[PDB]
Write an enzyme that holds these catalytic residues in place. Structure first.
Site, PDB file in Angstrom:
ATOM      1  N   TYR A  79       6.160  -9.917 -11.753  1.00  0.00           N
ATOM      2  CA  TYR A  79       5.269  -9.736 -10.939  1.00  0.00           C
ATOM      3  C   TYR A  79       4.843 -11.112 -10.649  1.00  0.00           C
ATOM      4  O   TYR A  79       5.232 -11.735  -9.634  1.00  0.00           O
ATOM      5  CB  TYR A  79       3.777  -8.893 -11.139  1.00  0.00           C
ATOM      6  CG  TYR A  79       2.943  -8.765  -9.866  1.00  0.00           C
ATOM      7  CD1 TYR A  79       1.704  -9.574  -9.641  1.00  0.00           C
ATOM      8  CD2 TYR A  79       3.218  -8.058  -8.679  1.00  0.00           C
ATOM      9  CE1 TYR A  79       1.215  -9.648  -8.479  1.00  0.00           C
ATOM     10  CE2 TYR A  79       2.548  -8.290  -7.617  1.00  0.00           C
ATOM     11  CZ  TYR A  79       1.284  -8.974  -7.392  1.00  0.00           C
ATOM     12  OH  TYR A  79       0.848  -9.152  -6.260  1.00  0.00           O
ATOM     13  N   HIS A  95       4.093   0.003   1.781  1.00  0.00           N
ATOM     14  CA  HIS A  95       4.238  -0.740   0.682  1.00  0.00           C
ATOM     15  C   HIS A  95       4.211  -0.015  -0.756  1.00  0.00           C
ATOM     16  O   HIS A  95       4.892  -0.752  -1.855  1.00  0.00           O
ATOM     17  CB  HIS A  95       3.033  -1.868   0.738  1.00  0.00           C
ATOM     18  CG  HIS A  95       3.064  -3.113  -0.426  1.00  0.00           C
ATOM     19  ND1 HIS A  95       4.468  -3.828   0.164  1.00  0.00           N
ATOM     20  CD2 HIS A  95       2.804  -3.540  -1.400  1.00  0.00           C
ATOM     21  CE1 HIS A  95       4.451  -4.769  -0.979  1.00  0.00           C
ATOM     22  NE2 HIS A  95       3.480  -4.557  -1.787  1.00  0.00           N
ATOM     23  N   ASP A 145       5.862  -0.527   6.414  1.00  0.00           N
ATOM     24  CA  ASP A 145       5.111  -1.488   5.458  1.00  0.00           C
ATOM     25  C   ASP A 145       4.231  -2.348   6.640  1.00  0.00           C
ATOM     26  O   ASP A 145       4.498  -3.147   6.823  1.00  0.00           O
ATOM     27  CB  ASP A 145       5.776  -2.177   4.512  1.00  0.00           C
ATOM     28  CG  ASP A 145       5.142  -2.881   3.451  1.00  0.00           C
ATOM     29  OD1 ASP A 145       4.076  -3.082   3.424  1.00  0.00           O
ATOM     30  OD2 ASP A 145       5.850  -2.953   2.491  1.00  0.00           O
ATOM     31  N   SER A 165       6.755  -6.160  -4.338  1.00  0.00           N
ATOM     32  CA  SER A 165       5.823  -6.989  -3.732  1.00  0.00           C
ATOM     33  C   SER A 165       5.997  -8.590  -3.956  1.00  0.00           C
ATOM     34  O   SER A 165       7.039  -9.116  -3.961  1.00  0.00           O
ATOM     35  CB  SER A 165       4.345  -6.691  -3.882  1.00  0.00           C
ATOM     36  OG  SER A 165       4.128  -5.460  -4.058  1.00  0.00           O
ATOM     37  N   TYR A 166       5.030  -9.153  -4.811  1.00  0.00           N
ATOM     38  CA  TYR A 166       5.157 -10.470  -5.089  1.00  0.00           C
ATOM     39  C   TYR A 166       6.484 -10.544  -6.239  1.00  0.00           C
ATOM     40  O   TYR A 166       7.031 -11.470  -6.209  1.00  0.00           O
ATOM     41  CB  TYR A 166       3.923 -10.984  -5.797  1.00  0.00           C
ATOM     42  CG  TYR A 166       3.852 -12.732  -5.916  1.00  0.00           C
ATOM     43  CD1 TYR A 166       4.634 -13.209  -6.658  1.00  0.00           C
ATOM     44  CD2 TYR A 166       3.174 -13.319  -4.826  1.00  0.00           C
ATOM     45  CE1 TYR A 166       4.397 -14.617  -6.796  1.00  0.00           C
ATOM     46  CE2 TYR A 166       2.877 -14.865  -4.945  1.00  0.00           C
ATOM     47  CZ  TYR A 166       3.802 -15.333  -5.940  1.00  0.00           C
ATOM     48  OH  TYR A 166       3.999 -16.797  -5.837  1.00  0.00           O
TER      49      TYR A 166
HETATM   50  N1  NXZ Z   1      -2.782  -8.449  -0.547  1.00  0.00           N
HETATM   51  C1  NXZ Z   1      -2.815  -9.346  -1.898  1.00  0.00           C
HETATM   52  C2  NXZ Z   1      -4.075  -9.062  -2.617  1.00  0.00           C
HETATM   53  N2  NXZ Z   1      -3.483  -8.746  -3.966  1.00  0.00           N
HETATM   54  C3  NXZ Z   1      -4.596  -8.499  -4.928  1.00  0.00           C
HETATM   55  C4  NXZ Z   1      -5.961  -8.528  -4.974  1.00  0.00           C
HETATM   56  C5  NXZ Z   1      -6.700  -8.543  -6.078  1.00  0.00           C
HETATM   57  C6  NXZ Z   1      -8.040  -8.514  -5.979  1.00  0.00           C
HETATM   58  C7  NXZ Z   1      -8.961  -8.331  -7.311  1.00  0.00           C
HETATM   59  C8  NXZ Z   1     -10.368  -8.407  -7.249  1.00  0.00           C
HETATM   60  C9  NXZ Z   1     -10.995  -8.535  -6.148  1.00  0.00           C
HETATM   61  C10 NXZ Z   1     -10.304  -8.664  -4.787  1.00  0.00           C
HETATM   62  C11 NXZ Z   1      -8.635  -8.694  -4.780  1.00  0.00           C
HETATM   63  N3  NXZ Z   1      -6.008  -8.323  -7.458  1.00  0.00           N
HETATM   64  C12 NXZ Z   1      -4.634  -8.492  -7.593  1.00  0.00           C
HETATM   65  N4  NXZ Z   1      -4.099  -8.403  -6.377  1.00  0.00           N
HETATM   66  C13 NXZ Z   1      -2.323  -8.822  -4.247  1.00  0.00           C
HETATM   67  C14 NXZ Z   1      -1.646  -8.553  -2.637  1.00  0.00           C
HETATM   68  N5  NXZ Z   1      -0.270  -8.658  -2.347  1.00  0.00           N
HETATM   69  C15 NXZ Z   1       0.404 -10.152  -2.927  1.00  0.00           C
HETATM   70  C16 NXZ Z   1       1.478 -10.562  -2.122  1.00  0.00           C
HETATM   71  C17 NXZ Z   1       2.181  -9.270  -1.816  1.00  0.00           C
HETATM   72  C18 NXZ Z   1       1.786  -8.114  -1.254  1.00  0.00           C
HETATM   73  C19 NXZ Z   1       0.289  -7.632  -1.868  1.00  0.00           C
HETATM   74  O1  NXZ Z   1      -0.214  -6.513  -1.298  1.00  0.00           O
END
Ligand code: NXZ
Ligand SMILES: *[C@@H]1O[C@H](CO)[C@@H](O[C@@H]2O[C@H](CO)[C@@H](O[C@@H]3O[C@H](CO)[C@@H](O)[C@H](O[C@H]4O[C@H](CO)[C@@H](O)[C@H](O)[C@@H]4O)[C@@H]3O)[C@H](O)[C@H]2NC(C)=O)[C@H](O)[C@H]1NC(C)=O
Ligand SMILES: *[C@@H]1O[C@H](CO)[C@@H](O[C@@H]2O[C@H](CO)[C@@H](O)[C@H](O)[C@H]2NC(C)=O)[C@H](O)[C@H]1NC(C)=O
Ligand SMILES: *[C@@H]1O[C@H](CO)[C@@H](O[C@@H]2O[C@H](CO)[C@@H](O)[C@H](O)[C@H]2NC(C)=O)[C@H](O)[C@H]1NC(C)=O
Ligand code: NXZ
Ligand code: NAG
Ligand code: NAG
Ligand code: NAG
Lengths: 728, 728
Positions: free
Chosen positions: B509, B702, B670, B592-593
């Site tokens: 990740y 997604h 997506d 994703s990431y």
């Molecule tokens: N949109 C991005 C948002 N994201 C998050 C957000 C949070 C989180 C935790 C507590 C409060 C508010 C937000 N915790 C983990 N990941 C990964 C996601 N993302 C990153 C890049 C690839 C696609 C994706 O959905």
């Protein structure tokens, strides 16, 4: 032995077929581009001279894509900034160079983003389309006259076609026809107001932050079709003060009652146009003969002159009703018609007379009419040795129909069995083009005594190179299926051993009026699969295939995805019966209609095929355009042919794909067979738990023709075939 | 000896983890759905009584997706016709049932296509959003009062968020906050007028003839962002004759100067709201304290009460600025703030006072504040045994900060190292939820003397089933990289032999503030790969990973796709040195990431990895949303950080993919990481002549979460991993 024909040889065009592309400029002279110069050739004597040196445009400042010399030889139209659109359409920038003054035209130039340019058939008048409107230039340095004011992007098209007319009806972008004199300009107007739009993403270059949505008026099976209007302008009475007057020619009453297409425009004389109309139900066509009324300025079409062409077993013509070939006086014509036995033969028609006279007959078909003089009619047919996949030139004596002479049959019988021809203006000389079974041969002939004047291109340079390569061989033969002969071709590996078992790849198309078994010479993917990989590449022409009569062609009527699929299965079963095929290594592949048949064969549960590749396949007939689909399937309604549209999908066979290895390929910007078609196959395979292989090509259309994409697709399919056949 | 954990066991959920999902409704009671009934439980004693039999709705005529009992227990809100939208948003039909009258409310029903419904925190008032407008019902059978008239599809959002606020800011659809009394209703208004639209095809069912184009306001990195306004309505003074008056609360001057976000709304008392604002450049946040003026009807925010939170090494908070936890009088609060050493600790703030007091310190971080009473503050942290991937509940004595008590540490140390908690209102009781390393355990405790009351769920049924399966083991440890400890986890095959060489799959990740090495128990794809396929599945937490201080987390600031990529390469190099890993069989995968990192690692040319799988990867940061991207990368402008946006793409490394086997997967619908991202990778790989494997999933988003799609993707990736590792 030594080197084989590799994948790299195919992809990199290592072994170039030489052509002899000539342009007739009179009844005895032609132009030819022989590297850094344009040469004019005298047909009778063969002497030449430099027409134009390419050094003339060294300081032009743009790469010239193409040119067009005016009929009078006074001007050259230069095409640059070429931007491809669909199969035939494109946009370009155009400049005109005066050949006598030896300078470019600076004032009143053709505007940038011009859709289509055309010289008149004689002299130097120009007709061009810019922003869906027609413009006429009487002289290249003079201002244009505007013909139409109704032009509207994706809505109204004047002098150019919409998507469906370009692809299915005209097989061309232009919807402009100059009279022989250049006095009149006839044009079609297309209205796409209520035609639904196909929409898809275009990703473009990496630099584009947001993908673009492409929106194209495209009528899918049963949808609202574009409408058509036909007009004629007199280009000799154009006013600089008053707007141009266009006279409309309406469609016959038997056409106006419902949906119809304008399918053919032919000038018979200076004051007579022939128009062919076709009903949306493609088994009824009407030809109208329209004469100019000098004492009114209008065009009149007598109901008594109308000739009807209808079909009882299928649709009209091969793909569309065939074109008329008028005699010089324009009071009579010749046309290829299906006879009482179902064979396509030349019919002779006299305008104010009832029916027609067939001038040819037999268990073979006329492919096309090539030339007509006062004494002879020249035509191509597959009569010779009863081979439907052969093509030869013949001439019939107009004063005695029993006096038919084969002009190409015996020129070189072992090397040459597939001819096409190019006649000079008034048919004084002709160029013969043989495309197989041996290497292409280009020859010049005189119509006077049918004497051979000169060999133009013999491909001797390729002949010597190919002697140095382990080349495969081609077997062209037939098998019997239900008391009928059905032709097949096989690309056999070099040093072919009949006591050894070879893997077989079935190369399929099988669309209506198709032919995959012929005498043509080709350097393609199959050449590599047989030469390097030692795979037999077979093609078969079953029910629905063309050039063998309507009994075979129409067998598929209102029933796409039945007999042409079954016949591919039976061909493979019969090739398996031959003792040189490994029955455990039989694969199938196809592109477009070929992809639809491959997918249908793979989902049949025959157990004959181990694997298969479908490139840009059709999956359901409702996703394909109305013009092509309805020609063979009727309408997708419960009263018409809904039951067969529902029973002929790839998705409905999804369960049977568990028995096979399947590779599904499609380009994302395919404007023809929409990505949607493969998106629905993949979704049905996933819904049923079937594992398969997929490949999308970003921004590629139906051809997957971009250099890097063409190379990647063939490389990807080769790895798949080799893995499936356990090849290293 | 006996059965392994197969792919089918994973895909068919053969071994299910039991949960104990409870809903606190008072300080001593909770709701529990126990098969055919909703029960009410008494925490102290454990006795229960049926609250509602599900036989009540047998004749309802729709499948009830979810329910919500009003705070007073008088009504139940029934949710049916559920239609999922984004990660949090959905639409549904809603009905209200009177629990006393024992009948459905047939008059003044919540309309169909309702976007969001919310009970007030006390009593039975309702606030719902329909067609982007807010409506208030004082009583369930009475007509609604309209609050907003500005609602406009894809343009103006009242009480609900747009795409970007839902995904990145609120992590919720709702933008409605009732005051504790239910007197006031505070709401946010979003304006997406100039926000560019992402457009993509939706193919739908086979029956849809033309694909649909989906158009979503989505700001990509550097694009026009939605604007925000904040309002408060008094729900006690609503008129049936006059329109509702909404009082606007203006953002501070230090926020109004440019682009900003509303990042947090917290009611401190009945007449005091806390608002947190963040600049578009995400290193500066301002908290406003706003009090109701009873002698004006207006809300005033003193500039002296404003608390600024800024970052010098990175961004504010983990993903967003942390929430304030107010004391009962609302004059003081507790917030998790990064200290002077870079560790996230609890800070104590007094409203009209200058700075804060840290109540916790150390080389560990506070994960969250769970409860606050007059005597104690309850929080979760990773302090225990210095394990960043462990989680425990602690309480700090508010009268002496040195008096910290671990409440979960020693309950079951071998089985339980990862806790989360659910407190009753006023925190008299807490449910502890342990998720590993052993099987999840659910317990109930009393806060008074921290006595264990009851075991709620021990997973004894799963324990016995798993004793019958060859289960893999988990090793959680660390390696040293440049004088710093970095944690990793390994899923080792059953009967693990350290003298034998096993293939290794790196599960990645590596996003900012991520953690892949933890003590949680999981039954997933990795469980199958180690149990059935005998593959070591490893995960590593390098630079940019969270819960270990800002020195580690902020290392990736303005430099995504550098250190987190390098650290995955180094982890694999170090796992290769361990003598139980086959150095010739090292693969990498991520979603994703994770897909972005896998692709960056594969294009690095390290030679460490044989193959890799990227599912829905980011490929270029300019294609991803502004809120998330700009938090870590700044703006993609030459005045800001364009050079790193350009240097951190997958496309630029296309040449290095010749060295590896690559499988690229993406869903076509997506809405988050657009298909465009993978469409650009494939195009760059084709442009460079790299063969690779691809798979699109028609209409999947997604998650690729549809039952058939989830099974197909995992089946497809398993075949890929097996052939790459030469497994049968
Ligand atoms: N949109 C991005 C948002 N994201 C998050 C957000 C949070 C989180 C935790 C507590 C409060 C508010 C937000 N915790 C983990 N990941 C990964 C996601 N993302 C990153 C890049 C690839 C696609 C994706 O959905
Ligand atoms: C391309 O094709 C379209 C149709 O797809 C065609 O547009 C149609 O144009 C006509 C005429 O301009 C319009 O038909 C009318 O509708 C309006 C109301 O919206 C009425 O005013 C009309 O009634 C009057 O006129 C009638 C006959 O002319 C008489 O009943 C009477 O005198 C009335 O005063 C009439 O119903 C129509 O708006 C469109 N249709 C659509 C679908 O847009 C268009 O003209 C074509 N373009 C070209 C260049 O051929
Ligand atoms: C073929 O050769 C003939 C004969 O040399 C060329 O005809 C002459 O050339 C010019 C241009 O037409 C005339 O002004 C002469 O009067 C012609 N002389 C004769 C004897 O005919 C002819 O043009 C050549 N053709 C090509 C295409 O190069
Ligand atoms: C747990 O059992 C207790 C004792 O029976 C219930 O509390 C009593 O029962 C009724 C109904 O609520 C009241 O009228 C009495 O005043 C209660 N007595 C005491 C001493 O508390 C309680 O309701 C039960 N709880 C659940 C959730 O079933
Ligand atoms: N649009 C369909 C049109 N088509 C043709 C047309 C002609 C032809 C020959 C002479 C005159 C006019 C047309 N000859 C061969 N094929 C196949 C194609 N098609 C069929 C189904 C799949 C996709 C496709 O492009
Ligand atoms: C061509 O067409 C018309 C009559 O058909 C005539 O008036 C015009 O001037 C002609 N031009 C010629 C024959 O060169
Ligand atoms: C055209 O097709 C229809 C529908 O199948 C048929 O009923 C009709 O007889 C056809 N027309 C001719 C001229 O055969
Ligand atoms: C939304 O923003 C635009 C500018 O993009 C502005 O013209 C309009 O007034 C706004 N609408 C509301 C309801 O605030």
């Amino acid at each position: 032995s030594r080197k084989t024909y590799t994948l790299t040889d195919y992809l990199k065009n290592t072994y170039r077929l030489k052509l002899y592309s000539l342009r007739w400029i009179s009844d005895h002279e032609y132009l030819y581009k022989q590297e850094n110069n344009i040469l004019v050739f005298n047909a009778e004597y063969g002497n030449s001279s430099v027409f134009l040196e390419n050094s003339t445009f060294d300081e032009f400042g743009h790469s010239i894509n193409d040119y067009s010399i005016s009929p009078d030889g006074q001007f050259i139209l230069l095409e640059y900034n070429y931007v491809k659109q669909w199969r035939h359409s494109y946009t370009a920038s155009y400049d005109i160079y005066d050949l006598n003054k030896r300078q470019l035209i600076t004032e009143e130039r053709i505007p940038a983003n011009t859709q289509w340019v055309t010289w008149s058939p004689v002299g130097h008048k120009l007709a061009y389309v810019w922003n869906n409107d027609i413009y006429v230039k009487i002289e290249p340095n003079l201002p244009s006259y505007r013909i139409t004011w109704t032009g509207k992007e994706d809505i109204i098209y004047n002098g150019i076609t919409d998507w469906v007319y370009e692809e299915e009806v005209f097989s061309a972008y232009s919807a402009l026809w100059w009279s022989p004199n250049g006095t009149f300009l006839a044009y079609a107007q297309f209205n796409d107001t209520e035609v639904p739009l196909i929409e898809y993403s275009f990703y473009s270059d990496e630099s584009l932050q947001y993908p673009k949505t492409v929106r194209v008026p495209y009528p899918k099976a049963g949808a609202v079709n574009p409408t058509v209007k036909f007009f004629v302008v007199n280009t000799d009475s154009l006013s600089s003060v008053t707007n141009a007057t266009s006279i409309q020619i309406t469609a016959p009453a038997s056409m106006l009652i419902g949906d119809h297409y304008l399918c053919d425009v032919t000038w018979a004389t200076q004051e007579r146009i022939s128009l062919q109309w076709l009903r949306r139900i493609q088994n009824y066509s009407v030809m109208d003969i329209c004469d100019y009324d000098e004492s009114s300025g209008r065009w009149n079409c007598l109901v008594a002159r109308q000739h009807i062409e209808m079909s009882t077993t299928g649709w009209v013509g091969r793909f569309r009703p065939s074109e008329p070939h008028f005699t010089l006086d324009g009071n009579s014509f010749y046309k290829i018609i299906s006879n009482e036995e179902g064979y396509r033969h030349i019919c002779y028609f006299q305008i104010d007379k009832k029916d027609c006279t067939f001038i040819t007959k037999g268990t073979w078909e006329v492919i096309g009419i090539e030339a007509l003089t006062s004494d002879y009619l020249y035509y191509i047919s597959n009569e010779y040795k009863g081979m439907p996949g052969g093509r030869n030139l013949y001439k019939i004596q107009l004063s005695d129909y029993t006096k038919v002479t084969c002009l190409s049959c015996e020129l070189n019988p072992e090397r040459c069995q597939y001819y096409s021809v190019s006649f000079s203006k008034e048919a004084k000389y002709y160029q013969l083009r043989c495309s197989g079974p041996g290497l292409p041969l280009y020859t010049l002939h005189s119509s006077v005594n049918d004497k051979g004047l000169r060999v133009l291109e013999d491909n001797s340079a390729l002949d010597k190179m190919l002697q140095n390569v382990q080349m495969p061989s081609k077997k062209l033969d037939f098998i019997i299926l239900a008391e009928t002969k059905f032709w097949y071709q096989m690309i056999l590996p070099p040093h072919f051993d009949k006591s050894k078992k070879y893997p077989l790849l079935l190369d399929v198309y099988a669309g209506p009026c198709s032919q995959k078994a012929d005498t043509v010479f080709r350097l393609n993917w199959a050449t590599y699969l047989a030469s390097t990989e030692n795979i037999i590449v077979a093609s078969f022409d079953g029910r629905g295939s063309g050039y063998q009569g309507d009994k075979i062609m129409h067998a598929i009527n209102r029933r796409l995805g039945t007999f042409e699929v079954e016949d591919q299965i039976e061909a493979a079963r019969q090739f398996s019966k031959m003792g040189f095929v490994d029955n455990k290594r039989i694969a199938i592949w196809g592109w477009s209609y070929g992809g639809y048949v491959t997918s249908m064969v793979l989902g049949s549960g025959s157990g004959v095929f181990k694997c298969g590749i479908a490139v840009a396949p059709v999956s359901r007939w409702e996703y394909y355009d109305s013009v092509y689909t309805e020609r063979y399937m009727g309408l997708p309604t419960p009263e018409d042919n809904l039951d067969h549209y529902r029973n002929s999908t790839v998705m409905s066979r999804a369960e049977n794909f568990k028995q096979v290895e399947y590779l599904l390929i499609h380009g994302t910007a395919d404007d023809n067979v929409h990505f949607q078609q493969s998106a629905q196959i993949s979704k049905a395979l996933v819904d049923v738990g079937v594992d398969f292989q997929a490949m999308w090509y970003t921004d590629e259309d139906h051809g997957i023709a971009s250099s890097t994409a063409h190379q990647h697709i063939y490389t990807h399919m080769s790895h798949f075939i080799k893995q499936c056949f356990s090849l290293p």
